[PDB]
Design a protein around this ligand. Structure first.
Ligand code: 5YW
Length: 258
């Protein structure tokens, strides 16, 4: 029943709103300069960084990087909450549950981080601030280009013009990918995704009727994502040897063991 699908879609979008305090709709009101109460502090140089700690809530490149690190722990929490709401997810093998989040967390983080970017920079601290692409990019080696690729993916991704309701389904599709390393029972996972894929199909058709083959165009983005992830992990591994005086959060480090 399509009705059965639209209901799954409402359900999902619902959980998405509940789990994720900074939606893409809110992000874009902030980035388009909608209102006079939502205007971010703009961070584009070192004194702006300084003053920005006063208006919004060790070394510079390092303080920024750990600024992402605590963030990503937050995201993981968020995603974990969402995951629990996906029909079936919690019933699966527990060792599978862990696996799916372990490989799905980053790919989701980058999908939703795009919501907060535009071609000039990225929103930080729940929309209170905005760090310009150029500043990030001038960050010393090897922190210069830890964010560059993410921008590239976002600008491409953001042009598909998805909205929150589309994304809720799409991050559910990611979580339930039967092709993840160490998965115990794959079938039960794929049966849930099949439904998710099915929902997303209908969703995109209804919501974006003039967006031809969007559904397939969206599905191929999963390759760009994976690419970004591997580039990430690699970059971290160099960070960890140049910077033996630098910590990684426990939750984060569980995710990284392969
Ligand atoms: C990444 C992304 C971001 O860049 N996110 C980000 C980056 C930098 C900062 O701040 C830099 C100094 C101003 C922030 C702001 N948030 C924090 O660092 C932070 C907020 C709150 C707390 C705290 N709150 C209550 C009690 C105690 N502490 C601490 C720190 C945000 C990135 C890269 C790749 C993927 C995703 C994200």
């Amino acid at each position: 029943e399509s009705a059965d699908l639209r209901a799954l879609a409402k359900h999902l979008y619902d959980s998405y709103i509940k789990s994720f305090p900074l939606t893409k709709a809110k992000a874009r009101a902030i980035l388009t300069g909608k209102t006079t109460d939502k205007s971010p502090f703009v961070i584009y140089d070192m004194n702006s960084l300084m003053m920005g700690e006063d208006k919004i809530k060790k070394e510079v490149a390092i303080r920024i990087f750990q600024g992402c690190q605590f963030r990503s722990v937050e995201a993981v929490q968020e995603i974990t909450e969402y995951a629990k709401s996906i029909p079936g997810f919690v019933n699966l093998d527990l060792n599978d549950q862990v696996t799916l989040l372990k490989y799905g967390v980053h790919e989701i983080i980058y999908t939703m981080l795009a919501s907060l970017m535009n071609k000039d920079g990225v929103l930080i601290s729940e929309g209170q601030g905005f760090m310009t692409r150029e500043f990030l990019k001038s960050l010393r080696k090897p922190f210069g280009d830890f964010m560059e690729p993410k921008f590239e993916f976002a600008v491409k991704f953001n042009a598909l013009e998805l909205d929150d309701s589309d994304l809720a389904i799409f991050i559910a599709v990611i979580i339930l990918s039967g092709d993840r390393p160490g998965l115990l029972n794959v079938k039960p996972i794929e049966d849930i995704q099949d439904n998710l894929l099915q929902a997303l199909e209908l969703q995109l058709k209804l919501n974006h009727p003039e967006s031809s083959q969007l559904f397939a165009k969206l599905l191929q983005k999963m390759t760009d994502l994976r690419q970004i992830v591997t580039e990430h992990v690699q970059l971290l591994q160099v960070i960890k040897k140049t910077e033996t005086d630098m910590s990684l959060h426990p939750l984060l480090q569980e995710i990284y063991k392969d």
